[PDB]
Each structure stands twice: as structure tokens, then as C-alpha cells.
């Protein structure tokens, strides 16, 4: 993942605008769609594209792609724009319509913004492989606080098993 996959995306973005003669989002999205999809396959998640979600307002909204788990539970989202728009301006309108913000990569072909827990965690340039590979690591690993607390309780056992084994040995 990381370098290998991101560098293939950089070449694919170039092949799309070269063999297609279009820098339109609807055509250039395939590059980041396949980055997010192939990274997910390795992390036990899948990027399912165009999945309609409902907002608090009741407005149905369809992000470009959602990161679904094995139990059909959304864990992250993605929206691509073209290079011919202001990413920051499209961001307020998107979230105003009722877009999710728990874990969303808003991305134009040149800049990528990760918004986690409602705040912009990182803003990288897609030209820098290592930088993008860093942001995508945080996106694919962001976990809800439920699993964050379970993981912490597993660590508690690693220092509680000795104390527990004493009782069982005393009983044996």
C-alpha cells in the first residue's frame, strides 16, 4: 500500500487526462476510486460507490463513495471535485446540504482534505506520494470510540492475566 499504490494512482490520473482528453471529475475520479478501493481490500473494508445516506434534515445525500465494513456499516466517506473549482467553497455547500463529517476525504485532483470528528485533520498535496499515503493511513484506520475503548480493554488484560492466573493456580 502506501507508496506503491499512491504512485500507481499518480500515473493513472495522468493516463486518464491523456488518453481521454477530459479533466472532468466524472472521468478523473476513477483514479482515486481505485486507490481507495485497492487499499480497502487489504484492510478488510470495501469502497462501495454512490451509496445514498440520509442527513439529520431528512435530505437524501449520495457521496461519491462510502467505506463500508463487512457488516454493511459505514466507517468513512469520499467526495471528488474537478481541479476547476475551489475545494474550500464546495466544502461548505456540501456539508450544508447535509454531508457526513465523521471521516470524509474531500478531494480535487490536486489537493486532499481529511475531516475527522468534524474538524480538518490534514490537508495534503496529491502530488506528494508520502504525504497522501499519510492522510490515507489516518482515513482507513479512524475507528469509532466503541472500538477505541475495546482495544484499550484488551491491553488491560495483558497486565491483568498474571493476577488472574494466580487465582486459578491457587484453585488447582
Partner 1 sequence: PAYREKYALNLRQEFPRIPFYPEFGRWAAWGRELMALHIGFESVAPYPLKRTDEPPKNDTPEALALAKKARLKVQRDAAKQPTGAVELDGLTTLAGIPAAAWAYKLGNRSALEWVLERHKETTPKDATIREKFNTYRFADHKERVIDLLARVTTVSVETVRIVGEMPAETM
Instruction: Lay out the site mask for Ca ion across 84-113 (x = CB under 5 A, - = otherwise).
Output: ------------------------------
Instruction: Lay out the site mask for Ca ion across 109-148 (x = CB under 5 A, - = otherwise).
Output: ----------------------------------------
Which one of Ca ion, partner 1, none is in contact with 73 (Cβ closer than 5 to 8 A by kind)? none
Task: State the binding site for Ca(2+).
Answer: 25, 64, 79-80
Range 39-45 contact pairs with CB under 8 angstroms and sequence separation of 24 or more: 39/1, 39/5, 39/136, 39/140, 40/67, 40/140, 42/1, 43/140, 43/141, 44/69, 44/70, 45/69, 45/75, 45/140
Instruction: Lay out the site mask for partner 1 across 36-75 (x = CB under 8 A, - = otherwise).
Output: -------------------xxx-x----------------
8 Å CB contact between 45 and 75: yes
| Pick 2 or 53: Cβ nearer Ca ion | 53
State the chain's maximal CA–CA distance in angstroms.
76
Of 86, 81, 114, 85, give the one whose Cα is nearest residue 100.
Answer: 114
Q: Under the rule (CB under 8 A), what is the footprint of partner 1?
A: 55-57, 59, 91-93, 95-96, 98
Amino acid at each position: 500500500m502506501s507508496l506503491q499504490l499512491v504512485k500507481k494512482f499518480q500515473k493513472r490520473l495522468e493516463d486518464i487526462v491523456a488518453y481521454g482528453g477530459t479533466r472532468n471529475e466524472s472521468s478523473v475520479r476513477a483514479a482515486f476510486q481505485q486507490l481507495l478501493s485497492d487499499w480497502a481490500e487489504g484492510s478488510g473494508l470495501r469502497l462501495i460507490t454512490e451509496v445514498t445516506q440520509k442527513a439529520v434534515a431528512g435530505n437524501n445525500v449520495r457521496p461519491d463513495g462510502t467505506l463500508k465494513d463487512s457488516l454493511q456499516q459505514s466507517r468513512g466517506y469520499w467526495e471528488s471535485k474537478d481541479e476547476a473549482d475551489t475545494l474550500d467553497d464546495e466544502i461548505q455547500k456540501k456539508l450544508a446540504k447535509g454531508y457526513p463529517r465523521d471521516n470524509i476525504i474531500f478531494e480535487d485532483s490536486r489537493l486532499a482534505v481529511l475531516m475527522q470528528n468534524g474538524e480538518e485533520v490534514q490537508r495534503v498535496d496529491m502530488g506528494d506520494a508520502g504525504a497522501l499515503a499519510g492522510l490515507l493511513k489516518l482515513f482507513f484506520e479512524f475507528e469509532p470510540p466503541q472500538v477505541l475503548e475495546f482495544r484499550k480493554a484488551v491491553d488491560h488484560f495483558k497486565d491483568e492475566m498474571p493476577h488472574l492466573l494466580k487465582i486459578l493456580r491457587e484453585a488447582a
